[PDB]
Amino acid sequence: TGYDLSASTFSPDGRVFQVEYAMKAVENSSTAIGIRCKDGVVFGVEKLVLSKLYEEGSNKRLFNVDRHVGMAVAGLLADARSLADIAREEASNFRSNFGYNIPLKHLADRVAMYVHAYTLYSAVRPFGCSFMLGSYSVNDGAQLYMIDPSGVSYGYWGCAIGKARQAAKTEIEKLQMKEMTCRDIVKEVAKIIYIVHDEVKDKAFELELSWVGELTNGRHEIVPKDIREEAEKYAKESLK
Amino acid sequence: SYDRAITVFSPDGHLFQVEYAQEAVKKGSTAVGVRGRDIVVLGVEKKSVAKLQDERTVRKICALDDNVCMAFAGLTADARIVINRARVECQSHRLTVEDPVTVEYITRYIASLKQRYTQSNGRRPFGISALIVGFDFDGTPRLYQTDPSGTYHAWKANAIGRGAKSVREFLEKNYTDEAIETDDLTIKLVIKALLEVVQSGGKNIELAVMRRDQSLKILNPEEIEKYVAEIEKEKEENE
Amino acid sequence: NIKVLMATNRPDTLDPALMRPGRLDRKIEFSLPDLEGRTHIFKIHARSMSVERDIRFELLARLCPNSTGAEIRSVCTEAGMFAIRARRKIATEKDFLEAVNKVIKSYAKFSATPRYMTYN
Amino acid sequence: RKIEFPLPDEKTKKRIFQIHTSRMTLADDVTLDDLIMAKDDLSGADIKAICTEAGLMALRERRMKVTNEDFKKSKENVLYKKQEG
Amino acid sequence: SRRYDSRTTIFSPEGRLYQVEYAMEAIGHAGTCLGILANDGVLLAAERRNIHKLLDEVFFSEKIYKLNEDMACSVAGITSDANVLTNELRLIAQRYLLQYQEPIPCEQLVTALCDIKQAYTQFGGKRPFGVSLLYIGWDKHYGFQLYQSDPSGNYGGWKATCIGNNSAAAVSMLKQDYKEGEMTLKSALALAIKVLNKTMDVSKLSAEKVEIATLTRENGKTVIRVLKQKEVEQLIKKHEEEEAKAEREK
Amino acid sequence: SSAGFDRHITIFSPEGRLYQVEYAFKAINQGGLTSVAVRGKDCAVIVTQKKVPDKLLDSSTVTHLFKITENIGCVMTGMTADSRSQVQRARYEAANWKYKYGYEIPVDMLCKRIADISQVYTQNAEMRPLGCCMILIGIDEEQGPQVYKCDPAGYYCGFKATAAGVKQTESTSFLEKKVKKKFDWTFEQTVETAITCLSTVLSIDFKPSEIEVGVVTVENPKFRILTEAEIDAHLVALAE
Amino acid sequence: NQYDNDVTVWSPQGRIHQIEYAMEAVKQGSATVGLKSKTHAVLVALKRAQSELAAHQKKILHVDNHIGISIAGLTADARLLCNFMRQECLDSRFVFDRPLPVSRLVSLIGSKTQIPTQRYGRRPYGVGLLIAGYDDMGPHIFQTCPSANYFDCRAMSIGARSQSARTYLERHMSEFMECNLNELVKHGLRALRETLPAEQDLTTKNVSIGIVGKDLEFTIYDDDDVSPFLEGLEERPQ
Amino acid sequence: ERGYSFSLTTFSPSGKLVQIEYALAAVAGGAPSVGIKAANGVVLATEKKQKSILYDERSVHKVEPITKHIGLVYSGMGPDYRVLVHRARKLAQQYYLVYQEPIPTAQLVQRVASVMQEYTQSGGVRPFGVSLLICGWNEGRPYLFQSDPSGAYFAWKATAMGKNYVNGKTFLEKRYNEDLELEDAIHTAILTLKESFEGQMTEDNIEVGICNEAGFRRLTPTEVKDYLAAIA
Amino acid sequence: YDRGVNTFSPEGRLFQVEYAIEAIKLGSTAIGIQTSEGVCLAVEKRITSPLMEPSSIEKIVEIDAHIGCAMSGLIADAKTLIDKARVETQNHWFTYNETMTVESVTQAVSNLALQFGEEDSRPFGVALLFGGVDEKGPQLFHMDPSGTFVQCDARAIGSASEGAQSSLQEVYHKSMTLKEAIKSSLIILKQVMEEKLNATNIELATVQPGQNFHMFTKEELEEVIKDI
């Protein structure tokens, strides 16, 4: 006892338990994945509807930090909105100061040093949020970064965050990043977001998809989920 | 700086440090005091003096203005700052409204200060009770005591310190309106009340008066022995 | 086949107290003092002695909060204490209520008997 | 009933003391009052046992009579018993 | 964050300040200082804690600190905490000399210190000061003075004093050797070397182990006279002569 | 041993040893990394490796070879967040050396700066002691190349060939068996010892896509990370 | 239970307990029901007075010319986020000279109540807001929580035994869209009559009803303009 | 950072400062060192064993000058040593700016002792685990002072700190003496550092500095290897 | 387990506010009654000994001319809220040139009923009774340590609260007059006090639109008690 309470105390085996408890706090939240193609970044978040709870489009875990950068948060939600406001403000500082649009590398550093900066004191608690960062610029290419509650930021071609995490990142190695256009990769996400999280746990669900890349011309926005409706047209035909 | 609430509510409703820190009042020197209709008299007892050493530095009846006398119990160290802050307060009142300091005002100052000294962060509450006696402007004498709660409270006579129930029980047998029809009956009344107090060998009894226009007069051990003489001779007349 | 009847003090011990929803039923409570029932705890002395015609229940009943039954049974009894001591042939409510406000305060000075605290 | 025991007062110590020294014959200069009059916050056991110290030296000389010259001076031992002990 | 707090300020449920008692118990170790009833003079006594043959003796004062033209003090207990208190106290005295062009009287110098020690006892969550030091000096009004300090901040003026725990026996010896106004500094120094003889446990009172600082009022010098061992040794032989003479009664 | 809270914050034990720093000395061992630095005659070699447990993680982001200035490189062990948070303080204090003192900072002084800040993390009782281990190289005037190591206990420290991390208790025992002899140090001798000292440890003898080699050499004194092709040239150049 | 101490300490299960205990402070408040149409928004509360002689403590408080909030739980913190609510309304009313849409107001409540849920020695706010107003795109019914997670619903209810209100609302959510005010309100407080035991009224002296509309500024009715709404309801079944 | 600021160093029930005693135990776990004043200047000797043959002795120095006439060594832990090294470095220079005069070592140990004693009481720190030896040649008589984690300061003739300081203390009780020369202090200093060393002592093990009265000069491994050749 | 002074309960509620409510129970009693003509008010001074002077004790201080008050529990905590509430009324009058309504006073106090903490110590231990006559008529109010402020028509507090409320709903109706209510309070007081009711124990306080001011003098109370 006594080694798990505060964040600033090492445990005798040599790890920090508040950080380890922060890692598996995101483990209870629902699955949200991401993947990049050769010219764009595709997001997808499965969202939970039990009976009535909310109007369609409530508390969307897809955010929009800059003109060309977006979030895909999973875990506890309020601190994820706090990181959305802080990363928003950091893109405002870089945009105001140095005159050009923020690269995804500096944004990953300046956010990840804050997420780390709340794991050094017993003033605060470590965050309980993990989020994706997708972007595209013609002098940059599509990058996809992944920030955990511990503060580690690095780069995937594809990732997954949630309960069904390993099962939802098992199948991504079947897909090919290098050749595919992202317009395929939309339904190529929605097929396994429909496949993972089988409906015995929760009766119903609802899907969000957000898509930035070359076709949207740098601007990040949600795809019109009604428009082309490619998800469930493949997904009801993907059970057999 | 120093952000921590020292004094919090106990689940049975009490503050501890207020209603516990009166034990430091209970284990200090005693002090009594009555008010005459003309001359007041207060005095400290249980001095426990070394009886071969100096005595003016252990003097624990002092003044704020000449209008106002002090008397207190408990540990004197915390009482010193209350006295000096009370003096700095009662001088700027002279800088304002040109009458001298009314005693009820200065008792609201020590009481309000001691209240917010309990209320604030990271501050041990004071462990003193104190008396504030002074014949005010328009010649009217009155007295008040303090409290570590900070509740000023006007008595006719005093018992604070060790055995306050003893002397405070004793002065109900005092309060016949004959006492005090004379000022020598008031002073010998205080010392005869301090007979039931600690040893009362004529050494540890330090009394001081104020004759309603005069500065306060620390009496020498000259008429204390004569008041013990007429008190013991009066007890010789009591049988 | 005997059912059971169980009296205790504090909510712990928890295991039979969390086993009792697994088996037992009927969690009820003292009784305890009330604004009213004290008059019956003061009427347990009704047929006792001979009540002076001017002795009143409600007068004393309204003066005694959190009385339980214990002391306030002796409260009416400590009249007979000073009665025999002061030779009083029968007792007047003023006689003990002088020693009652004493005996409540004198015994509430040191001890409030915080029954609320015992199980909390 | 829970009985409150008050500590002895000045005349209670006077009322208590003579019951002991009633049997132990005091010398001429021995006085009950002045000693216990100056002493404060005693116990009935001590004020009973303060006579035993004179029951040593006077009995070491084998004397039926208490002497205050000792009873004063020997009281320092019981005074030392309460003071230092 | 608050469960690591040590609570140095709060009253403890029996009646007393819990921390100031353990403050006074540290003054009860490692210190021995006293002063004497003296006209036309006043003396201080000091006991060498480190009497090893390997120190330098180049400080020219080991337990006496000269903090004005007219005053001094005697450290007891944790020494460097008093090396905070003499910087603070010396600066208080010197700023009073700035504000008034007149030497500081000793009383308000004492209260001006004890409000700081008291200020750490009252509030802070802070380790209190652990020094109970003495005071000597001259003033315009009251001639010569002695004072006493506490970690609680309560001060008293003496005419013969007690530092530290070994000096309670020196208080019994001073009341058993009491007088009223006799100095005649050889009488006061013979009494002081007598008290340091019979109180300190090491026999014969070696000339290195003791230290005496005197203050004679001279117009307008007010000399703080710190005396060397060559006038300690013949004082020791004077007292040993008085012990050899006084033992002849039996 | 223990007395009080000495097993929790950085206060002394009754034997004369704080426990939080000697927990930090095995806060490195969660990383799983061997990193060896060798100082040659006119050159100095960093060797590291990486673990790529996914095919979706990148090869371009997980490189621990961080560049501080254009004459100073470094490599990191220990946990990731403390390691990267050390790096911006290294870069920032190097840049303030350039602004204040006008000439390029020696590699000696930067480890004194980082060691003193890590001391201030150790000294004060309510802040976590940053369990990463810092390793520097660089070039000085007339002093050849230099290697330094900064442990999270606050001492600047630097030797002929040093290695700390997970497996390095035996790696230092191999470097004692390899340094003290009559051999000089040429360039491919230092590189060919930097691999084989680590290949004696792990006993794998693996592909050149795993070890990252940063090097510095006084012909062109700029810090330089090798391309994979010339890494393969060294790695088959050692195979006789 | 030593990790039930403060807001800083995470659980070994991943659930920070101070938030759960503050949710318990949400459930202890009285019932209130907010539900919208496409053209209006109606929130109805139920007061619960202390004794007979004391007047019933009110819930619905006016905030802006279109923003109104219900409350359950603590009261002083409701005045705190009330004063912050007014001040952030008339800030942008002072600067931009337009009223604020609701959907960017509530992010100031989340970022306002966030920081007292993370740093040491700061409690969360026991709070029960049911926000209602117009932006240009119609009505909105939000709810808050002390964990600061705001939900865009079509109808919710918070307070004591408010789940019965929900299980009323789900079998009428297909019919709570087209209808206008006079049956929308009684469709509101039918959920309140299911939040009570079935042996006492449903009086006039306790229920308060607030509506916000397009040609109708936000208005609170109190027992007497309420008395025209409570007339003509169905009897509670046997 | 938070304003916690409470002193974790409190009093014992006996009245003993506990963290200062434990910090003195952490001094006793440190490397041995000895320093001798003798009649023209002061010689400080320290004992530095690299834990491996891999190490470099040219990088870290233990004898560290403070002015051009003041040296300073320790016996304790280096990371707590260098902080008050730098604090003394900045602290002497305000004296050189105000008074325009080379600062006396007596003033140094007063001020550094004030820093350290003032640091034992402040908000939530451990005390330093360092015991210093401070030397120098001011006004014609060379000085040697010792401080400690209690903030105290002593004036030793020839002392020793670290491991076996009762062994080197009794050795410096008799073998150290009235008066020597500068080279004669080096012999007995290397001997008393050769009391508790390993089986070999080279130019890389010891590292010895002196104070001439004309100025400081830290010695080189050339003469450090020449004097210990000549076992002591 | 001295925990974290601002921490919620398992029920939950603020621990220290819930502990603060129990501090009202050992304080002295009081009685307020709202009349259509005004507001009468009653308290007991609780004389501790014949040593003390009885008339220096304050349980009613009068905030403005037209807004009365009644304090309870710890008096020295109450004095701070009194003196600052007066400042808030005067600031209302000097920005606005009108009388501050009786309602907004208790918002202006209860907005700082909860300011305890470490940054930005303990909550107050008083239960106030505010009276007064604004333009809305004679209002009678009541605030707690929690700040939960509510109108009360006829409120009791303190130790006697249970029996005084419980006995008090029986004897109250909508059309009470003033001199009916004044002698309707002292019946309850002489039931609930332990000392004999006389000229030194209690004090009344009335405030009316047409009977003002109209404070609280002696020898009125002599006529008031002797009507029993």
mmCIF file of N, CA and C in Angstrom, chain G residues 61 75-84 86 123, chain I residues 81 84 88 100 103-116 124 130 143-149:
data_model
loop_
_atom_site.group_PDB
_atom_site.id
_atom_site.type_symbol
_atom_site.label_atom_id
_atom_site.label_comp_id
_atom_site.label_asym_id
_atom_site.label_seq_id
_atom_site.Cartn_x
_atom_site.Cartn_y
_atom_site.Cartn_z
ATOM 1 N N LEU G 61 -34.528 29.154 -13.015
ATOM 2 C CA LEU G 61 -34.110 30.536 -12.880
ATOM 3 C C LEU G 61 -33.796 31.112 -14.251
ATOM 4 N N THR G 75 -27.128 24.408 -4.236
ATOM 5 C CA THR G 75 -27.763 25.666 -4.608
ATOM 6 C C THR G 75 -26.740 26.777 -4.792
ATOM 7 N N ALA G 76 -25.727 26.824 -3.924
ATOM 8 C CA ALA G 76 -24.733 27.889 -3.972
ATOM 9 C C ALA G 76 -23.879 27.784 -5.226
ATOM 10 N N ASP G 77 -23.528 26.553 -5.606
ATOM 11 C CA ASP G 77 -22.806 26.348 -6.856
ATOM 12 C C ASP G 77 -23.686 26.644 -8.057
ATOM 13 N N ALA G 78 -25.001 26.493 -7.904
ATOM 14 C CA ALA G 78 -25.916 26.899 -8.958
ATOM 15 C C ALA G 78 -25.942 28.412 -9.101
ATOM 16 N N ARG G 79 -25.789 29.134 -7.989
ATOM 17 C CA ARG G 79 -25.595 30.573 -8.112
ATOM 18 C C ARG G 79 -24.231 30.912 -8.693
ATOM 19 N N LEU G 80 -23.232 30.051 -8.492
ATOM 20 C CA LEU G 80 -21.894 30.336 -9.000
ATOM 21 C C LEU G 80 -21.851 30.197 -10.520
ATOM 22 N N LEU G 81 -22.276 29.039 -11.034
ATOM 23 C CA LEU G 81 -22.382 28.864 -12.478
ATOM 24 C C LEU G 81 -23.515 29.684 -13.073
ATOM 25 N N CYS G 82 -24.462 30.128 -12.249
ATOM 26 C CA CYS G 82 -25.433 31.108 -12.707
ATOM 27 C C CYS G 82 -24.777 32.448 -12.998
ATOM 28 N N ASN G 83 -23.927 32.932 -12.092
ATOM 29 C CA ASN G 83 -23.313 34.241 -12.297
ATOM 30 C C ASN G 83 -22.293 34.198 -13.422
ATOM 31 N N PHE G 84 -21.544 33.095 -13.516
ATOM 32 C CA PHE G 84 -20.674 32.882 -14.670
ATOM 33 C C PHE G 84 -21.477 32.761 -15.959
ATOM 34 N N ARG G 86 -24.532 34.259 -16.641
ATOM 35 C CA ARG G 86 -24.893 35.631 -17.001
ATOM 36 C C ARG G 86 -23.713 36.380 -17.593
ATOM 37 N N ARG G 123 -13.146 20.723 -5.292
ATOM 38 C CA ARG G 123 -14.235 19.784 -5.488
ATOM 39 C C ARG G 123 -14.881 20.012 -6.849
ATOM 40 N N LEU I 81 -20.485 38.420 9.087
ATOM 41 C CA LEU I 81 -21.542 38.471 8.083
ATOM 42 C C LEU I 81 -22.464 39.660 8.284
ATOM 43 N N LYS I 84 -20.445 42.901 7.060
ATOM 44 C CA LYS I 84 -20.259 42.986 5.621
ATOM 45 C C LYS I 84 -21.593 43.088 4.889
ATOM 46 N N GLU I 88 -22.879 45.750 1.988
ATOM 47 C CA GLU I 88 -23.539 45.422 0.731
ATOM 48 C C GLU I 88 -24.861 46.179 0.579
ATOM 49 N N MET I 100 -32.238 48.447 -0.641
ATOM 50 C CA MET I 100 -31.998 47.067 -1.031
ATOM 51 C C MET I 100 -33.081 46.161 -0.467
ATOM 52 N N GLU I 103 -34.758 40.250 -0.076
ATOM 53 C CA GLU I 103 -34.304 39.054 -0.772
ATOM 54 C C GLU I 103 -32.834 39.133 -1.150
ATOM 55 N N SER I 104 -32.418 40.228 -1.786
ATOM 56 C CA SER I 104 -31.109 40.269 -2.425
ATOM 57 C C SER I 104 -29.986 40.373 -1.411
ATOM 58 N N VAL I 105 -30.317 40.744 -0.171
ATOM 59 C CA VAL I 105 -29.344 40.706 0.913
ATOM 60 C C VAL I 105 -28.833 39.290 1.104
ATOM 61 N N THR I 106 -29.733 38.311 1.063
ATOM 62 C CA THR I 106 -29.340 36.960 1.422
ATOM 63 C C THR I 106 -28.718 36.243 0.229
ATOM 64 N N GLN I 107 -28.993 36.717 -0.990
ATOM 65 C CA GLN I 107 -28.118 36.325 -2.086
ATOM 66 C C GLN I 107 -26.734 36.910 -1.903
ATOM 67 N N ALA I 108 -26.658 38.158 -1.437
ATOM 68 C CA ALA I 108 -25.369 38.829 -1.330
ATOM 69 C C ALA I 108 -24.538 38.278 -0.175
ATOM 70 N N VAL I 109 -25.168 37.522 0.727
ATOM 71 C CA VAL I 109 -24.414 36.817 1.758
ATOM 72 C C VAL I 109 -24.179 35.363 1.360
ATOM 73 N N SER I 110 -25.200 34.712 0.812
ATOM 74 C CA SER I 110 -25.105 33.281 0.557
ATOM 75 C C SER I 110 -24.286 32.985 -0.692
ATOM 76 N N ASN I 111 -23.932 34.011 -1.467
ATOM 77 C CA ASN I 111 -22.982 33.789 -2.551
ATOM 78 C C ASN I 111 -21.577 33.583 -2.010
ATOM 79 N N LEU I 112 -21.330 34.009 -0.775
ATOM 80 C CA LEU I 112 -20.106 33.674 -0.071
ATOM 81 C C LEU I 112 -20.356 32.877 1.197
ATOM 82 N N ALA I 113 -21.512 32.222 1.311
ATOM 83 C CA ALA I 113 -21.670 31.178 2.321
ATOM 84 C C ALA I 113 -20.680 30.035 2.109
ATOM 85 N N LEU I 114 -20.296 29.776 0.858
ATOM 86 C CA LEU I 114 -19.296 28.760 0.530
ATOM 87 C C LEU I 114 -18.109 29.411 -0.173
ATOM 88 N N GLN I 115 -17.097 29.803 0.597
ATOM 89 C CA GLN I 115 -15.819 30.226 0.043
ATOM 90 C C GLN I 115 -14.630 29.482 0.621
ATOM 91 N N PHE I 116 -14.846 28.390 1.342
ATOM 92 C CA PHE I 116 -13.725 27.751 2.010
ATOM 93 C C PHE I 116 -12.859 26.990 1.011
ATOM 94 N N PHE I 124 -18.977 28.727 7.539
ATOM 95 C CA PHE I 124 -19.515 29.446 8.682
ATOM 96 C C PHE I 124 -20.455 28.564 9.485
ATOM 97 N N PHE I 130 -33.380 36.537 8.803
ATOM 98 C CA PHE I 130 -33.533 37.895 8.300
ATOM 99 C C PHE I 130 -35.010 38.246 8.268
ATOM 100 N N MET I 143 -31.354 31.653 6.425
ATOM 101 C CA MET I 143 -30.227 31.095 5.701
ATOM 102 C C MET I 143 -29.435 30.195 6.629
ATOM 103 N N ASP I 144 -28.716 29.289 6.014
ATOM 104 C CA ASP I 144 -28.031 28.179 6.647
ATOM 105 C C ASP I 144 -26.543 28.283 6.320
ATOM 106 N N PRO I 145 -25.672 27.415 6.850
ATOM 107 C CA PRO I 145 -24.286 27.414 6.355
ATOM 108 C C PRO I 145 -24.140 26.957 4.917
ATOM 109 N N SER I 146 -25.101 26.194 4.397
ATOM 110 C CA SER I 146 -24.956 25.656 3.050
ATOM 111 C C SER I 146 -25.270 26.704 1.997
ATOM 112 N N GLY I 147 -25.853 27.823 2.404
ATOM 113 C CA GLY I 147 -26.296 28.845 1.488
ATOM 114 C C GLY I 147 -27.662 28.578 0.913
ATOM 115 N N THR I 148 -28.268 27.446 1.257
ATOM 116 C CA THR I 148 -29.579 27.121 0.727
ATOM 117 C C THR I 148 -30.613 28.016 1.390
ATOM 118 N N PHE I 149 -30.867 29.137 0.744
ATOM 119 C CA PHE I 149 -31.726 30.192 1.235
ATOM 120 C C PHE I 149 -33.152 30.040 0.733
#
